[PDB]
Design a protein around this ligand. Structure first.
Ligand code: A1A0T
Length: 298
């Protein structure tokens, strides 16, 4: 009986040595099995596979606990959707553009590149170790796994049309924002003190206008107190002037002929427009902006 030793895992942190019979498929021995995202369930082991790490579905209590501790989801479909995405995202190119990890365009991923760029410019503490780990890898240039996880957590497949604001929101719902706060106070003549407080993720997002200045001035009429490391402001795509130094980064969205495309604008020493692998510098920017992000900087 020919055999090799492989490692199985659900988290790539805890590795479980296995002895595999080379005359049977991985599926026969492990159930659904993946090698770097590729479905090798129906494949017989190769000698090149010796010593390699394979992902498996959490079929026992031990693996189920390891998966829950790493991903913080009980969805039994997660790992398979994660692997399905990783098989694609591993083949994407991740150029460094103006000091940030971006993604060369493929598979309708402009929204993911724009989200990835934004995530590198705001302070976020992810709760699932899987996201915290891959976040720090992506920030160092190895972003394939992070992108595959974003797709899995957002319940989106490679190639599906995506929205930066949505993606950011759903990632925020996997972060520790417990200390973020927005207090709204009613401006009235005869209604007394009327106040409501948004804590957590609701505090870091707003829909209706792009301008933080207008929002802080007031929004029937409300005085606002904002306490968060960042805020995401979104509005319908509209021609909008981005002035250097007045924002951290922004999403541009065009919908010519109903085929959308995102670009990312970041404010450094001047305005940089990152469009996947492409980089364009300018002193002024006017375009159809739909998200603007602002950083508190303590
Ligand atoms: C009242 O607050 C808002 C805030 C944002 C708004 C945005 C849109 C958009 O069109 C998105 C632009 C960005 C791109 N997505 C598309 C991406 C794929 C699916 C839709 C579409 C429309 C209305 C909005 C209203």
């Amino acid at each position: 009986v020919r055999t090799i030793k492989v490692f199985t895992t659900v988290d790539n942190i805890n590795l479980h040595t296995q002895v595999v019979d080379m005359s049977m498929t991985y599926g026969q021995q492990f159930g659904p099995t993946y090698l770097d995202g590729a479905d090798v369930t129906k494949i017989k082991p190769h000698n090149s596979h010796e010593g390699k790490t394979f992902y498996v579905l959490p079929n026992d209590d031990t693996l189920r606990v390891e998966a829950f501790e790493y991903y913080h989801t009980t969805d039994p479909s997660f790992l398979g959707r994660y692997m399905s995405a990783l098989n694609h995202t591993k083949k994407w190119k991740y150029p460094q553009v103006n000091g940030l990890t971006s993604i060369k365009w493929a598979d309708n991923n402009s929204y993911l590149a724009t989200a990835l760029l934004t995530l590198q410019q705001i302070e976020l503490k992810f709760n699932p170790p899987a996201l915290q780990d891959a976040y720090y890898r992506a920030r160092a240039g190895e972003a394939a796994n992070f992108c595959a996880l974003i797709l899995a957590y957002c319940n989106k497949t490679v190639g599906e049309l995506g929205d930066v604001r949505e993606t950011m929101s759903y990632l925020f719902q996997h972060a520790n924002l417990d200390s973020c706060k927005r207090v709204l106070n009613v401006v009235c003549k005869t209604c007394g003190q009327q106040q409501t407080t948004l804590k957590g993720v609701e505090a870091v997002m707003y829909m209706g206008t792009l301008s933080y200045e207008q929002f802080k001035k007031g929004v029937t009429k409300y005085l606002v107190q904002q306490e968060s490391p960042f805020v995401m402001m979104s509005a319908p795509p509209a021609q909008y002037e981005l002035k250097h130094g007045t924002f951290t980064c922004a999403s541009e969205y065009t919908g010519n002929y109903q085929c959308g495309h995102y670009k990312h604008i970041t404010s450094k020493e001047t305005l940089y427009c990152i469009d996947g692998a492409l980089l364009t510098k300018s002193s002024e920017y006017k375009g159809p902006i739909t998200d603007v992000f602002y950083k508190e900087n303590s």
